[PDB]
Design a protein around this ligand. Structure first.
Ligand code: FES
Ligand code: FES
Lengths: 64, 63
């Protein structure tokens, strides 16, 4: 089964690259491909996990 | 309906990773396909996933 169902389907391989210095105090990245704000997490993983029985969640890059 | 993660840390009810930006190296490549054997880091397993399913997923790079 496909993981990504609707995001940027004209792109054969979706990669995001960011400069660490350009991130704010807390960046929350989506790993479920259900966020309406992809590549950022909007909490869509909660709905995905509840509907499917999954346990996925985001990647957080924060300031010390 | 279909699960995204099939075999990683199933004893964890919600897999979240949190890193301090100052602690990251010159280039960190994070897995977004939940097929990497080095999760949360990308090991290129997305290539096999995309070919077998027709998907277009790939990693997150912090450089
Ligand atoms: S919305 Fe996808 S990991 Fe939170
Ligand atoms: S191994 Fe999963 S995105 Fe590369």
């Amino acid at each position: 089964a496909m993981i990504n169902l609707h995001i940027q389907k004209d792109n054969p391989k979706i990669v995001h690259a960011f400069d660490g210095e350009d991130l704010g105090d807390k960046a929350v990245y989506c790993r479920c491909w259900r966020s309406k704000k992809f590549p950022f997490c909007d909490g869509a993983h909660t709905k995905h996990n509840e509907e499917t029985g999954d346990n996925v969640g985001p990647l957080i890059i924060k300031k010390k």
